[PDB]
């Protein structure tokens, strides 16, 4: 199938809510080894977002049931989903490292794919264990930081991809590293830097940025509320 036929199949699969098909089509477009269009990139991301996301939700569900007398298949089932999830992550991570990240020309695109690299390493570390877990968590932190550095130097503080990264990396610090301190630091900074330079907002993606800034603000007020204290009362 030709690149165009694939992208068209992908768009139809999206509409049909056949994400496995959508992922399949865009993987093949990526595997053609070319600098994906922003539309192509978006399609690939949205597809895999939905493929991995499904397994993440089932995992969390089965894991919740595991907390609440032959729960031997519950474990087996969690492990089945765990296996699927890893294969999905290893599918998208190979795509990133082998094609996506090296083919990225503009820093806007490089930041996106590095953000993505930390996102799927975070998904991995959520089900990972032992020394394997400490590797994924570090691989996540590396990818997210590498992107964060490129974003601070090449993108405006209001950029939706820069802001989106801020939210996800801040969530990683909170959820994964269990550092509310570093989480809030990142989110406060990113938000404050963006409100300070609101004139940098793009007329095409302004409601994208404001929306993400609201999510950062919401997270900060939630996270600081979960980290109160003492003493004079």
């Amino acid at each position: 199938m030709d690149k165009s036929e694939l992208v068209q199949k992908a768009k139809l699969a999206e509409q049909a809510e056949r994400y496995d098909d959508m992922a399949a089509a865009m993987k093949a477009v990526t595997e053609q080894g070319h600098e994906l269009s922003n539309e192509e990139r978006n399609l690939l991301s949205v597809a895999y977002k939905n493929v991995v996301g499904a397994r993440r939700s089932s995992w969390r569900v089965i894991s919740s049931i595991e907390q609440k007398k032959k729960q031997q298949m519950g474990k087996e089932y969690r492990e089945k989903i765990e296996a699927e999830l890893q294969d999905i992550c290893n599918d998208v991570l190979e795509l990133l490292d082998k094609y996506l990240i090296p083919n990225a020309t503009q820093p806007e695109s490089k930041v996106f794919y590095l953000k993505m690299k930390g996102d799927y390493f975070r998904y991995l570390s959520e089900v990972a264990s032992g020394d394997n877990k400490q590797t994924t968590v570090s691989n996540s932190q590396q990818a997210y930081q590498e992107a964060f550095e490129i974003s601070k130097k090449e993108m405006q503080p209001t950029h939706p991809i820069r802001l989106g990264l801020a939210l996800n990396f801040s969530v990683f610090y909170y959820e994964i590293l269990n550092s509310p301190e570093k989480a809030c630091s990142l989110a406060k900074t990113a938000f404050d830097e963006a409100i300070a330079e609101l004139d940098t907002l793009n007329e095409e993606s302004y409601k994208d940025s404001t929306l993400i800034m609201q999510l950062l603000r919401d997270n900060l007020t939630l996270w600081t509320s979960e980290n109160q204290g003492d003493e004079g009362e």
Binding site: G53, I195, L198, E203
Partner: protein, 195 residues
């Protein structure tokens, strides 16, 4: 319309006439150009003060006002959206408008095209504005970039924050624009945000 153009020169005269010939092709009639000009000059202050207060306009004020209103008819689309900046000290009409909700300035909305306004000091409010119903008026008087929006133009507060200096930083978009305005097709979805 000439009835307005004549009535304009009869009240302001020299000051009104001054602005004629200040456009390349000229979408606006002689009457409209004059009213916009007279506004941009010194009448903007007293006129908006009167509109906001709800006070009864002067003959010359009503003249400028209907001259503007006439020009603000058809000048909506204007196919593209524009980013403009406005600062206020000691009160803003949008302070009454909470985030997500719409409200309007009972006077005309003067907003500069220069981002210097957004980075200006000792302000009360600083707002980055997105809209298309505005009229590009700069070059006309008396210096050298600014877009001005109609009286009672309803605006949605997309974002508000009272920064580490007490200054309110806002994001305003023209109510009309929609809900899909300002979003890059499926990028929010493609960003796989945590939320």
């Amino acid at each position: 319309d000439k009835a307005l153009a004549d009535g304009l020169v009869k009240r302001f005269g020299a000051d009104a006439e001054k602005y004629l010939g200040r456009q390349p092709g000229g979408i606006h009639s002689d009457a409209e150009v004059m009213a916009l000009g007279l506004y941009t000059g010194i009448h903007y202050a007293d006129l908006n003060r009167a509109l906001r207060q709800g006070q009864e306009l002067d003959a010359g004020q009503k003249l400028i006002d209907q001259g503007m209103s006439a020009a603000f008819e058809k000048s909506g689309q204007a196919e593209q959206v524009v980013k403009t900046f406005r600062g206020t000290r000691g009160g803003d009409a949008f302070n009454a408008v909470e985030e997500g909700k719409v409200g309007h300035d009972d006077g005309y909305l003067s907003t500069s095209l220069n981002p210097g306004v957004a980075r200006s000091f000792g302000q009360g409010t600083i707002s980055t504005v997105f809209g298309r119903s505005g009229i590009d008026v700069s070059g006309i008087s008396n210096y050298k970039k600014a877009i001005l929006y109609n009286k009672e133009t309803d605006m949605r507060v997309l974002l508000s924050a009272s920064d580490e200096q007490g200054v309110t930083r806002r994001v305003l978009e023209e109510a009309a624009l929609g809900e899909l305005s300002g979003h890059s097709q499926g990028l929010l979805d493609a960003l796989d945000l945590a939320s």
